[PDB]
A paper describes a structure:
Bdellovibrio bacteriovorus is a bacterium that preys upon a wide range of other Gram-negative bacteria, entering their periplasm and consuming them from within. Proteomic and structural analyses of vesicle contents reveal several fibre-like proteins, which we name the mosaic adhesive trimer (MAT) superfamily, and show localization on the predator surface before prey encounter. Structural studies reveal a variety of domain usages (and therefore binding capabilities) at the fibre C-termini, placing these on intertwined trimeric β-prisms. Using independent but complementary approaches, we identified and characterized a MAT superfamily of trimeric fibre proteins with diverse adhesive tips, able to fulfil the long-sought-after role of multiplicity of molecular recognition and handling of diverse epitopes (across a wide prey range), by the bacterial predator B. bacteriovorus.
To address the potential for domain-based diversification, we crystallized the tip of Bd1334 (which shares 75% identity with Bd2133 in the fibre region but then diversifies), from S818 and S914 onwards, diffracting to 2.6 Å and 1.4 Å resolution, respectively. The tip of Bd1334 has no similarity to that of Bd2133, forming a β-sandwich of a completely different, square-like shape. Tip trimers are mediated by edge-to-edge contacts, burying 6,900 Å2 per monomer. A composite pocket is formed from two chains, making a tryptophan cage with W1078 and W1102 from one monomer and the terminal W1151 from the opposing monomer. W1102 has an unusual cis peptide bond often enriched in binding sites. There are no structural homologues for Bd1334 in the PDB, and sequence homologues are limited, with sequence conservation patterns being non-informative. Thus, the Bd1334 data show that MAT tips can be swapped out in evolution and that Bd1334 is probably specific for binding an epitope encountered and bound only by B. bacteriovorus bacteria.
Numbering used by the authors:
A (entry chain A), B (entry chain A), C (entry chain A): 948 to 1151
Amino acid sequence: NASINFVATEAHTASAGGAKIIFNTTNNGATGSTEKVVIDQNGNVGVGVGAPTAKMDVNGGIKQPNYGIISAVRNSGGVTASMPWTNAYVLAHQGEMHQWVAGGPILQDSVTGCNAGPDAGVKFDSIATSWGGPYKVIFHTTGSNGAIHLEWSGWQVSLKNSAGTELAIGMGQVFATLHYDPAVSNWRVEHMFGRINNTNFTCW
Amino acid sequence: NASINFVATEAHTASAGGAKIIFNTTNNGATGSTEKVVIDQNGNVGVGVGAPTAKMDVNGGIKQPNYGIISAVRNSGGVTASMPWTNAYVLAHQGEMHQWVAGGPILQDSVTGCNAGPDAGVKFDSIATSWGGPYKVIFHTTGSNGAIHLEWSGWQVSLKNSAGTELAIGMGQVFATLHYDPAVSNWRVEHMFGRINNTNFTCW
Amino acid sequence: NASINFVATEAHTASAGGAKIIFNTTNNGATGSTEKVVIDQNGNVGVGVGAPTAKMDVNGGIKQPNYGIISAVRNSGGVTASMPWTNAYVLAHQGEMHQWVAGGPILQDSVTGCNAGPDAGVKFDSIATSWGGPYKVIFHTTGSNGAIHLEWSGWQVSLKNSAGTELAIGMGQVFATLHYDPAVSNWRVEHMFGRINNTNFTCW
């Protein structure tokens, strides 16, 4: 059995007063329904929480889609990128965060965008492993085209210079900002910084 | 057309058994409704997910409000802060996380709070840019007053010493803990650490 | 008063057309109900948002459970761990993120797992404080057993070598990957990296 109940949340002297919506379902194998969600009188939503204090109060974990491995490499070989959203989608979905686990990103712009600062032209060259690491991607804009702010940490990453020489290899972390650049018909790294093992790197 | 259906999730030999709530809406331009949300028999909520494994299982992005630029500067000039929540609101909303994109924070306490550790009295002096960066703010408490744990990374940040001398400028990241201090009638930085380019800084 | 309304989201020439579900509740002390949640025609859920652009669009904060302090220490003394989930639970809840505030983790493997790389065998030895810091834990897998990717930053952390000698103490940040290792009947640190004050550490 499942049901939706409207429940008073205070005494009602006038016919009208505070009220909430509760959503009840019966667990498999059970015979009685139990309250699973509430939209409270204050608009707070409780999921497994009866008196939510947060606007979205979740008594458990939060899951989003696995968007795979992200890459954006501009070098002597040309412009490439693997990005699981279009420019138009990112622009339509401003401010949205996405977190998932996957192999690390491959990131470089040794032509223009990330060839200034202390470590001009480096490649954050993640080796995909079973361990991988968490991505965090939030959608933003240059004002005309889609941009993303991307974070990832995990195993294993090779930091290479613009000549391809491995400078270090091990654990890697990066914060990077990418944008869709119409002048090269693809996503590019505008700036990024992070670390491989104990070595910080920065380019812009 | 929109509708709410109560659906059995297993065979029912006794009149009672497992059941879920499904919420159907019709996309604009469509003629048939499609299932958009489920509150499952186990209480898991699926949003675009039919058999959610997570308590809140979202087939897309998650958005929260844009809370703007955050600042808390105590120096020779006095005590200032720009904080988009009151002390009372933070105390009423413990444990809540907030993520958004905006210009970086401006942070310093060269009088007391962040004038110890390796980089006593520095200012994390973010220049607001179109790129900005992601904030993460989670609400906490000293036990009496509101505290926040704040993270931000992005472009562009000037690291200054307590005398105003620019030590470095470029990409910046900070983790900082701020609290509402009644002794100065405002928010202050209790401790923070991060980096500008490849230079780590730490104060407490 | 509380209510659930099915509302057209466009003109309907044929009997069928786009529609949304709105959920209305009355705030305590109020006499009229106000719209608190919408499941839109496109399946986007707005919580305090009338025309959500995100699949889960929340006009406020997001809260999850406080899972306490996490530890996993393997050294000369043996194998210990404090982990608020079982192996089976983590494996059933892949891809789920969890964020909360608590005292920092205690992490080391000086026998095998984290006794390579630049800082073999170190202990990230968090001292629990009232300030604490934010955890982020996302669930993953080795392919057979539960793994977690864990992040924490905050006050106060002692970085110790494998001999117990305090190398540094102050603000601490860690990214660590832990997994349930049946060969020692407990969770262990596979690799981690972070910083105490301005000192980066890395082990794998």
